[PDB]
Symmetry: D2
Subunit: 493 residues, 4 copies
């Protein structure tokens, strides 16, 4: 076949893990039971760019049982679970391009391949997906950047110069990711300069999983640059309040335990950013005896951290004394090379944000005279030549829970993924409203509170939760339906 994965012989382990995971993924199990016969997604071509773990394999299985054809890749070079990928290829329910420890070059080739579909009516013609499941916005990015590249290509009838240069606007070296994405774009311009624009015609939407990808979408829609409908899954209550916070509470610890040999108790651990992710990280770290110090730019989030008993400082105030540093900002250049040069001997550094940009990994790796050794797989020790002091970086600054461990557990991933499937169903069912002879610019929407509550209802039995039912008069008293929704749209939970 055409899938590219590490080892098909790992499939049986993957299949058995999926069955065990399904004990807690009650949302996905119910969607399969309810919709596998009617197949609401029949005829949809779905491309997914989302960390391919066992939990993700259950998502793909659900989409498949609902009638979709599927092509998939991971949204990080280190996050794929190879047995999970093998399971999908063995069952033949998706075409997969993913493996743990991809090179950045291979990453962009896998994504591009996941986006490429064969035309059943013409062996020569290529087409794209009808729907995209995205985590971090890379599938959405390559599509929009591809369209922009094709437009610039026609303007001067040549390969745009920005795709051939290794420098950016300010003369600074382009990130490897940008250079590797541009390499793919140049190759596609030479094969067919109408590829990306051609795909737009049959694209009915994208459902985005994480905060960083949603930020990208928000920038696009506020500028009239979003070229397909989008559903923001990150901001469903049953996603952000659970996955982002409670998922990290467990998965950050798992990543640190695997990557960092030291005891966490008693250590000064800096959590940079106290949003939904940072809140969960702090709770987990404190739970095992660490003394958490928070950094924040938001005065409200800073006060919330103080209410939980955490010191709030600017990084420079504590960088020479703290033991471990965890970035959870979704921002860039939060931990610079100059910060690293002042850290104590064998300080640990990790990132849990979507992109590696939070830490200046390139600057560290290219610091003049820096010495590097691999401590264990995906853990590296860097020694500065002047001081002879070392810092230890977990999985090259990539998201540590998925890079050094296996990401969030099945229960919260089922909550996030039940939202994903409902989003895909919504986009597919509404596809006739996508009329590009009338509107070519689109907006981001969220799932209804009714569906959000439904996602929660589907997982109550996993934990033996017994829900109270309102009486008719109580319902009238608080002005709600007995069946919900129970809260106003602006409720913060």
């Amino acid at each position: 076949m055409e899938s590219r994965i590490k080892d098909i012989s790992l499939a049986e382990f993957g299949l058995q893990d999926m069955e065990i995971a399904k004990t807690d993924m009650m949302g996905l199990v119910e969607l399969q039971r309810k919709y596998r016969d009617s197949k609401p997604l029949k005829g949809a071509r779905i491309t997914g760019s989302l960390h391919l773990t066992i939990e993700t394999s259950v998502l793909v299985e659900t989409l498949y049982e609902l009638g979709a054809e599927i092509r998939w890749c991971s949204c990080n070079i280190y996050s794929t679970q190879d047995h999970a990928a093998a399971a999908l290829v063995k069952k033949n329910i998706a075409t997969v391009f993913a493996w743990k420890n991809e090179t950045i070059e291979d990453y962009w080739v896998c994504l591009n391949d996941a986006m490429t579909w064969r035309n059943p009516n013409d062996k020569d013609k290529i087409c794209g997906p009808n729907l995209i499941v995205d985590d971090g916005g890379d599938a959405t990015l390559i599509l929009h950047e591809g369209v922009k590249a094709e437009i610039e290509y026609e303007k001067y009838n040549k390969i745009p110069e920005y795709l051939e240069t290794e420098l950016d606007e300010n003369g600074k070296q382009l990130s490897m990711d940008l250079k590797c994405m541009y390499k793919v774009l140049k190759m596609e311009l030479l094969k067919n300069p109408f590829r990306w624009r051609g795909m737009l015609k049959d694209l009915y939407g994208v459902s985005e999983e994480t905060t960083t990808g949603v930020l990208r979408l928000k920038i696009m829609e506020s500028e009239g640059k979003l070229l397909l409908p989008a559903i923001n899954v990150n901001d469903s209550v049953t996603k952000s309040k659970f996955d982002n916070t409670y998922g990290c509470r467990q998965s950050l610890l798992h990543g640190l335990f695997n990557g960092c040999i030291q005891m966490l108790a008693g250590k000064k651990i800096v959590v940079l950013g106290y949003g939904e992710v940072g809140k969960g990280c702090a709770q987990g770290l404190s739970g095992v005896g660490a003394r958490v110090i928070v950094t924040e730019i938001d005065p409200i989030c800073a006060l919330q951290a103080s209410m939980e008993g955490y010191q709030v400082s600017v990084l420079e105030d504590v960088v020479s004394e703290a033991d471990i540093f965890i970035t959870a900002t979704g921002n860039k250049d939060v931990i610079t090379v100059e910060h690293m040069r002042k850290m104590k001997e064998n300080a640990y550094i990790a990132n849990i944000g979507h992109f590696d940009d939070e830490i200046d990994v390139y600057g560290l790796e290219n610091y003049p005279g820096i010495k590097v050794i691999e401590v264990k797989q995906n853990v590296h020790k860097f020694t500065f030549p002047d001081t002879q002091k070392s810092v230890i970086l977990l999985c090259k600054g990539r998201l540590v829970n998925l890079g050094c461990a296996t990401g969030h557990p099945p229960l919260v991933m089922s909550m996030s993924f039940t939202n994903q499937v409902l989003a895909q169903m919504d986009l597919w069912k509404s596809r006739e409203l996508v009329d590009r002879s009338k509107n070519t610019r689109f907006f981001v929407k969220k799932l209804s509170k009714e569906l959000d509550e439904y996602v929660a209802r589907l997982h109550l039995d996993v934990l033996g939760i017994k829900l109270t039912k309102l009486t008719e008069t109580q319902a009238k008293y608080i002005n709600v339906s007995i069946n919900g929704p129970y809260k106003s749209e602006d409720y913060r939970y």
Copy 2:
């Protein structure tokens, strides 16, 4: 001097506590420093209906320093701190009608008096602005207008104001009966009193969840008669006061009212919203085993993620030791539930109103025996089983009834929002055009102001904030000076 308070000699203690509280109430301290010279509220008549604690006295002082004239009453019969009330009167900062342990009849007379301003000698006016907590000042206004319109239509006092029963034959609550008593009395003195106030009314700023629910209902029915600002839903209010305020003040209330150890006890928290979340955190912090009840499946899952068992009251009523209602709903704990509780089980409410517990049904149960264990703590014994339950402050909000409410730091956060809301309503008063039949609505303060409230309190706690570079600000799509989060962010 027409103020009605318990004891003016308590003023000294009140004034001293206000000065200590100000070390932490930096938002109010800054508003006073910044605006006492320009006086943005100069000439504004403000009526407040909000628990008169030491923290509230600092709020009143702030409104006074900004130029307003003030009349104040508490929004609960047990929540006033008498030394706080005395301080305000002694210093001539406001006219006060409030004391701890008011009868229900006096409560409504106090509120009515706080709403009454002078002009002629015998001609009266209403407030320009209202600071409300629970919606009682807003309620008496709207019900008063409604009573006046029906009185003028038939030239007789509306029948509903005279009867003791509701639509189904059940006795009206004592609070509703006493409010109606005042409304009838005012209809007979001046049948245009309430409608007369509307002309000079520029807005109400509402503090708590129950009051906001009341406002939304009025708004949806097109019956809101003045602009409103929802202060409860500022991030610096709901995420701090409702949750972290209760984490401390619920424990203070229980420690004062309940003699027993909380550690090891099964304590049921009914409702796991913003208040219930804080209650559970405090209870767990002192060793209790918290069990949650919920109607909202999302909230129930949240409780489970914090390690709490989520059950229906019926399955734990005979086994649990203490019950705390935090729903803002009614009839959550009934007489029948109470009869199944274990010997000396404790019952308390932290929601705005006493409605969560059927206190009337308990007090009026045939052959029930009651004894006062201590101030505002009563033991009820059923005649058939001879078993007893102990109720804290007749089901009234326990943190204010058995203790002194939230501490100065979070109250300053809530109250800085109140002052900003009052200033906003006053500044835009020229846009309230009564000749045009316009709909009034409920709005929230801007995120810019919300973040400002937080900024003013960072130094209290030695918080050091990081500043975004221009590059970083552009990367996350925000201004270096905020706001830092989208409008739908849940914190």
Copy 3:
């Protein structure tokens, strides 16, 4: 001296009612009354108690009374008495009480002396107690210092000089407590210089409640000066691990909430000493959002605090920045006037150790030009004249949980007091072994582990605890009896 001296007898009904409610949780005392009220194992015993007279203490007294003892009682702190608890006892006529909240230091010592004075029926001379229940060692102290004073008096047939001076060997002013104790001793030397030695004849033992009192007993024992058998109740496992730690977790908070108007969340609160009391204090404080900073002289205790996520610093390094200071050491001069002068405006200071000596209250009150105002009952604000800065002291440095609130709750006090009753029964039953005619050395002992486990068993039903029972095979495997004891003598729990 057969007439009680209390604040107000009309508070008796409230006291009686609180006692019945408290009994719901004090199942240890309820069971001892049920089991022994008929046989009266303490019949004929004269018991003098010097222990904070709260509602919980009224149930202890009721227990001793139901077991057949005659009782005289006083509190071991000038602020710890609950006046309604004292009234209940006098109304019921089950003890002669000398206690009220807010005693002068002079009246404290007069009350203790009155509690130690029993009527002699054989013409109108005085007797002492047969048994003593002590908390802090003041009853034990006045007895031993009384004997010393009489011996010194006999050497020269005059009142010893040390009883009359205002100074100590070093030349510094004696504490008010020492001066007032000495005035009582001089009075009794003038009345009858054989009083104290006469009491020894019928004195069979003392059961000591707290850490400070036990330290005093151990010093007397090692010097060969202990004049009666003693039982160390503080060190029962069911006392130290519960009362000292979990009692304070609740009662420190109650004290602080009553005395300190400020929010604890986010504040830097220094807990000086991280022993059994300090551990519980830190737990409670963190539980309501405080950031606890610990001071310690013991490296083991310091590491334990670090394992719970607390910063461990020396006071000098945090005195200018912290918000609230809580002494829990059992030592002296832990917070000096010089420390207080460096504290931030409106910093709060409180003590939870047995004696006020941890804080230099005398130096603060007598600081030249100091200004003081009563903020509320038992809360004082002191302002220094040179800086105009103020500090707020809770209940003049006396134990804050009892001074500003009502001490520990009934459940843990029942565990502590069940040990007290068992100790009293032990001392009484072995009274024939005390042979004053021989040059006998007296020692301190602890209750057996069997009785310690028994105390715990008696309270399991309070909390609905379901205990597992060992099978014969399991009991043999771990080498214990099915009925206990379950742990070796050196087990630390």
Copy 4:
């Protein structure tokens, strides 16, 4: 190569982890610095039977730097870190017989080989160790059982019958461990029936690491059968209060995260036993959102669990509703086959006690028609054919933190191992006092409180702890030396 390990090529990774671990193992770093020149253990032959992890390699390095010759094996078939073992062999500091995933037969062969020394004056002659580092008592067991076997062999001039039968005196199958130990003893009786008694001549002591091993020592001591001096390291305060509790708080979570795919949050997790290990387990589990239910036979421990907010139940009342079961009792038959048959679908079972005896793994494996599948490394799903329900067992009931993860982190292991080195030095230095012609009775002792406090002091800087120093006046007031010890011998911390 005399050593028997998995792969020598893993040495470089092991050596680098040792250097990183030393950042926190300041106790071992200091002992190396202080004693490497004088070599107090010069000439000592030390055999160790203790889980060979990276932390253990630093212990071995320390003993080696202090002059000892060393032979080592692990005390569990799954606990060895192969890279740690390779590091020791590569630098030639010990002869090692250990690898992860040993068969039980190989386990006993490795221990026997670790106990075998070729004396310096003749290659053909065999001798034993001078000192033993033991964790669980297996090295001590084979010695005593060896001696007993030799005595029974002489009594009838033949192989004792108990060594050849596969059944016990009750007709029940002997454990595989006992059968494999007996196989080695029989083999050694045929080669030299004086091997074990001959070793006694040069044996000066054993230092025991864990609770189960100490229990075994105390039983031997009480029956007068202990054949060498013993030091109980488990009961040093800096061992039991840190390793047993805080080590497990982190390492149980690590083992569960590796072995159990499910989210711990919201799950009913039963912790059987609330002693030192159980306390740490509960703290970590609740730190990541689990609802912990405790079982206990000790009423004091049961009340302690209740004070921390945990329900205390009997296994029978929660076996059908709970999600995960963790045994921490040190007892046997705590979880039987009958209990397992009642568990919900995909319930997880793990043990963290020293031996697998806590769970009836043999009964499970021998259940008629049971189906077993390997889910992942050291994780197996068992399906009962009559109900078709499955349970998932982590590492066949062997200690899960070491079986599914890497055991405790460096900081607490340094505290435990600093105690081990001091114990070995104490035993070695007092060797002349062992006179086997006269004193036939040996005892168990503990290290002094002075040394216990010293271990803590050595690790304060790791965590930036600043210790307060008593003034002369304060030291006199609390009756201690400024330099300690600071607590009485019965203090429970």
